[PDB]
Amino acid sequence: MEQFKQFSIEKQAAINSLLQLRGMLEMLGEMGINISDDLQKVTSAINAIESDVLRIALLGAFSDGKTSVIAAWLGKVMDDMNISMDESSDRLSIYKPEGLPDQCEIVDTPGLFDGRLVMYEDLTRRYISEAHLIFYVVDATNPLKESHSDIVKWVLRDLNKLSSTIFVINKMDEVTSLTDQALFDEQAAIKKANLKGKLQRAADLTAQECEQLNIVCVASNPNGRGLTYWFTKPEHYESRSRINDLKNAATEILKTNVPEVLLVKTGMDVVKDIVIQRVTLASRHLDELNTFVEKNDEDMHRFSNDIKQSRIEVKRLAGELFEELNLMEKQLMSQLRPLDLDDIRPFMDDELGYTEDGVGFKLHLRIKQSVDRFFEQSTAVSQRLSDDITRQLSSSESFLSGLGEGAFRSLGGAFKGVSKISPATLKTTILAARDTIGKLTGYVYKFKPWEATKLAGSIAKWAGPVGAAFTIGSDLWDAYKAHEREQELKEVKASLAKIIKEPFEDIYDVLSSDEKMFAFFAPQIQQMEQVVTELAEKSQAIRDNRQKLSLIQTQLAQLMVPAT
């Protein structure tokens, strides 16, 4: 991996990253977000970028052997790439060597190496800012000339190119043996430390910036023999010069710094930071929305289950109620059929009730207490149902309240403007459904008056005067013969049966049909079902939106993987 292939590669990566940016923009557009003309702006920056070529700013005094360092690194002696560098001109200058695998620009400011005016020229500042690599070449004996403080500051502080600058301590030969691997590294580390201290102090560097510094020790032209000669021995030279340490450092900077240079140069750094911000934000609040829409969708099914179970339970109670009332009636009837006329009054008193009003009060109260008990158990069922619906609605309200009123504005068009959807629009629909349910829910008291049944005069004479001790007189018993009396018994029993049966008949007709049964003992179950059914319908508009957005975010997440 060498310098022009790395660049060409980093160029392409940056172009790709911008095509993914374009893709990310199309999706925002799709969720009704701005764009203005960011799509065409991005295409333009891709085109501008295609032109660009590798650029190195070669900085340093010429006497520190800068020219050797760059030829060395490229691979070719200066004249073979038909270019020749001028020692003094008070301007910026650019060299575009030839016969190389690809093109590259070599920028420098020869005047500096009141020629210090070029540091404040927007032009020479732009050309060095927009370089991908900066070599500041210094001396091994006494690294960094005494006069250069403000140039180091210009590069590292003013222009802010520390991440892309390699200080190249050159001519290490005249400080150490190029043979003794372990001594070189000892002097190379001491010289790296020394220069580190002069730079930090020339440019106000912090301790952290100091660690970021790129320093490399090298011997471009070792012994003094020359490049033309040393290229003839390419693998001997590399071990001695340590030039590979420089190519490698340069390769890692390119790896990192080439895209930043290209993005900034075209103004796309800013475009891209904003787009990735809106997308990151957009999925973080789609996650919120999904949580709400999922929960709400699951509650709806949960509410219809509750209603089912509710209904199943009430049906079970209605049947138990019926079973209980049917025994009561069978029991009373089997007590009646064997009774002789003396037995009658005790029976009316003790089982039915016998008053001036008439007969039936005692039975009525006992039927009533059985009906009441069901009406209460069944009213409690409907109360447990209201409490679950009401609990879940409230936890949706509470989820949506913690989102913030602007939580969905990043999701674009449907959450902005006069028809906007928001946590508060959705909360409202929920709370009016919870309100309608808090008014349905109710124990009720409805008074149902009861009249007793008067006994026929004919049958009143076998019962006796109300509330008195009564046995049947001789005068009454010997007014009939047996067949005139056992018939008198039959029509009195006929009389009590009709009385006994009546109150059950009515209520069995109610329990025999679920429509009626429900309408009398548990109407709020149907009423709550209505409310739940309506709430379901009002939930469509977000479901429509959440779907579009999810399909959309799936694509965004894809486009965003490279950017992570």
Residue numbers in the entry: 1 to 113, 121 to 571
Verbatim from the authors:
Here, we show by sequence analysis and X-ray crystallography that LeoA is a bacterial dynamin-like protein (DLP). Here, we present data demonstrating that the leoABC genes, encoded within a pathogenicity island from enterotoxigenic Escherichia coli (ETEC) strain H10407, are dynamin-like proteins. This is important because LeoA has previously been linked with the secretion of heat labile enterotoxin (LT) through membrane vesicle (MV) biogenesis and release from the bacterial cell surface. Bacterial DLPs (BDLPs) share many of the qualities exhibited by eukaryotic DLPs—they polymerise, exhibit GTPase activity and assemble on lipid into filaments.
Monoclinic crystals of the protein in nucleotide-free state were obtained and the structure solved to 2.7 Å. The crystal structure of LeoA reveals a fold with all the hallmarks of a DLP including the key structural GTPase, neck/BSE and trunk/stalk domains. Helix 1 and Helix 2 at the N-terminus form an extended helix-turn-helix motif as observed in BDLP1, that along with Helix 12 and Helix 22 at the C-terminus bundle to form the neck domain. Within the GTPase domain, which is an extended form of the canonical Ras GTPase domain (but smaller than that of BDLP1 by three beta strands), Helix 8 is significantly longer than the equivalent region in human dynamin 1 but similar to that observed in BDLP1. The LeoA trunk domain clearly shares the dynamin canonical fold as observed in other DFMs, and includes a putative hydrophobic membrane binding/paddle domain. Consistent with this, the trunk of LeoA is oriented orthogonal to Helix 12 in the neck, a conformation not observed previously. This 90° kink between trunk Helix 13 and neck Helix 12 is mediated by Gly274 (inset) and represents the equivalent of Hinge 1a in BDLP1. After superimposing the GTPase domain of LeoA upon that of BDLP1 (apo and GDP-bound) and human dynamin 1 (apo), the LeoA trunk is observed to be fully extended, pointing in an opposing direction to the nucleotide binding pocket of the GTPase domain, and yields a ‘flattened’ conformation that is more reminiscent of human guanylate-binding protein 1 (hGBP1). Although this contradicts previous findings, it is consistent with the nucleotide-binding pocket of the GTPase domain being occluded in the LeoA crystal structure. Crystal packing analysis did not reveal any obvious physiologically relevant interactions of LeoA monomers with each other.
